[PDB]
Please model this.
Amino acid sequence: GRVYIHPI
Amino acid sequence: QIQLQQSGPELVKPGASVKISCKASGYTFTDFYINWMKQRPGQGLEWIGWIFPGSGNTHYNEKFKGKATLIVDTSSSTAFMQLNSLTSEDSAVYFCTRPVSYYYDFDYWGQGTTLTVSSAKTTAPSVYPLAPVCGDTSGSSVTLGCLVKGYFPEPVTLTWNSGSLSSGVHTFPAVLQSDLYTLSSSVTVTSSTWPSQSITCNVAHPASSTKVDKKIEPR
Amino acid sequence: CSQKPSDKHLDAIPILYYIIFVIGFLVNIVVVTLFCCQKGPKKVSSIYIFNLAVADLLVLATLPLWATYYSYRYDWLFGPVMCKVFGSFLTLNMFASIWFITCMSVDRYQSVIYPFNPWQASYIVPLVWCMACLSSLPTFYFRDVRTIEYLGVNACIMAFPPEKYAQWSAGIALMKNILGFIIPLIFIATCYFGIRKHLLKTNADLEDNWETLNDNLKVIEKADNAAQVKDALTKMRAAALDAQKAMKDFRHGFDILVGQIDDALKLANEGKVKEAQAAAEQLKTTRNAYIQKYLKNRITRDQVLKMAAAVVLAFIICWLPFHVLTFLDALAWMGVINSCEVIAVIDLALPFAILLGFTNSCVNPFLYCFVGN
Amino acid sequence: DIVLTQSPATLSVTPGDRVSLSCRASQSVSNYLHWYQQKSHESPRLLIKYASQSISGIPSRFSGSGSGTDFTLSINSVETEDFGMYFCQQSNSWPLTFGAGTKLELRRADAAPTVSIFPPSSEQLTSGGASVVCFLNNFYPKDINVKWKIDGSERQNGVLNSWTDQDSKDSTYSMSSTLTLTKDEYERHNSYTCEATHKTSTSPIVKSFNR
Model:
């Protein structure tokens, strides 16, 4: 539902 | 009292060994640590090693290990310091000493074994008067001298008038030079006295059985 | 659920990335000009410090770029091809920066077992960078700009196939743990567990003996009877008989110390308290000569150990936070974690836990070069 | 080895004055330091043990101080007897180590030397030798330089000199100087001169003779 948002 | 007696001056020649003694009297020998020092006339001391007679167990300073043992006799109550391959560099004094201790009032030294190294063998002195070259009319003081030269070993005692000359006298110490000692002595005296009053330097070198006088006569 | 990770809370992170950048920079530009100016020549330990301090200086290169992403509430400015680049290139250096610490720590262990020319550096140096890319292709592929569902913002995100997003985004998060922390630390920590093991064997713990010597002397020094003085000394003998077992002459120091206790025991079996006392007054000067030797040698064994520790702390202090939150982030993706108070805070924290991983890049220069000069 | 650095080397006291003797340490020696006195090269007298512990027999006026790395021996009023060497010894660790020592000598108004000169004796001349003596007598301070001359020219070799240690009566120093030449060279050259450098005259003190 979310995404992987962070630089890593 | 507690005492340490060391065997008196040895006459030694380059490369030869030695066995300096240290008789211990007053205290029971096998119970106390005994050190050995070195000293050069004008310098400070240098520690050689300790030994405990009740065991025989030792330790030494690195410098000395190569050329210094220590050894103990129970029955006799005497300590030794065996040196070897000796040279002008061991020309020094040596003390056996019980070191300082908190629980004791005092420490306890020897009295110093004087060790000289030099090839020369026993050699009588050569006394020479020293009268003023020019007889100047000094108003109050005229100085005469005496010169004891080219002798070995020590000691030699110089007097003036067989003892009766302590007024104005300066005996200067012996000085090794190419394996021989030279020595001198002044004496200031009133112009009135000398040469009317005879003045004589009385030399004595007991190693050569030698005794000599020179009356100090003018020019 | 899917949180609004944007808040008043991440207002900090833009400026820290700048401190870490400028500080992490000067420090790491030094490390390069040291090796760059005079070289090894052919020094294996100093060749790994370089590739590390380089990889560190590439991580730290891009931080003002990512300082935007957090400043613009996750609005990527640089368009979807630029997002793929720096994302992959960051992961690349991170993985390399860590895997050179892996090498350094294995080098430092071998530096200690066999303390004695560069040759294999030809494999190890490239082989790292190569896998740092092969480990960074998954990131190049899935990275992309998407107008993110909630925020209303064009974000630089690991865009997997929607159908199994949960599956990918998890396994990927596990591959960070394994390949970036679980394995590197097996290598890094067991190395510490080799220095501790070979600076305990290459040595002796004589303080168990030294205390006895120091204890039983103060007894002798204020003894009343012969009983106590004989007692103290019979313990001080056994102390020195072990210590003896343990080039250096240190062994003779214990020959001497036996041959000073035996003599004083001999006094104390007679009933001579003041004699025995003054006999141990001399012991103290044996012990003092040889205690002093022991402490100069153990300070050389000390500075060795403290640095092998500071290496594994600096690591764990910077790369555990990030790799825990990644394991939770990942468990949540599998569906093991549901509560959104958690998932609120996992995606409010990872920002900071990340910045820490880059602090290590700012730190290795102090650990690996600055010590010794 | 633990070096023990005494300072100063010389020190001109006056009977009545208190005096401090510095004995520093290259490393820590704790309270394990002992002081000593020595006058005529003889076995030295233990004055103080463990820095400040008093010795039975030693007079009160001697007191020790400091600890660890820096020690001093405060004599609370020097008298005539107190002159001679003082040596400090660490009892801390093998090898035991001594100071190079501090020599105490009496202060007094200065004194230019009395210079006598002597030739060779007739006794020494038939011997096949010739020694020119020159006495520098009853001077202070210790500082004096001697230079032989044969007809204006300087002469260094075949010269060996002796010094008195400070006198007891007046506390002056005295020096002797023997110029030993081959008799061959002696009665080639006519003049013979004894040049002396002391802190009285700026230009030196001289005696001479001419066979």
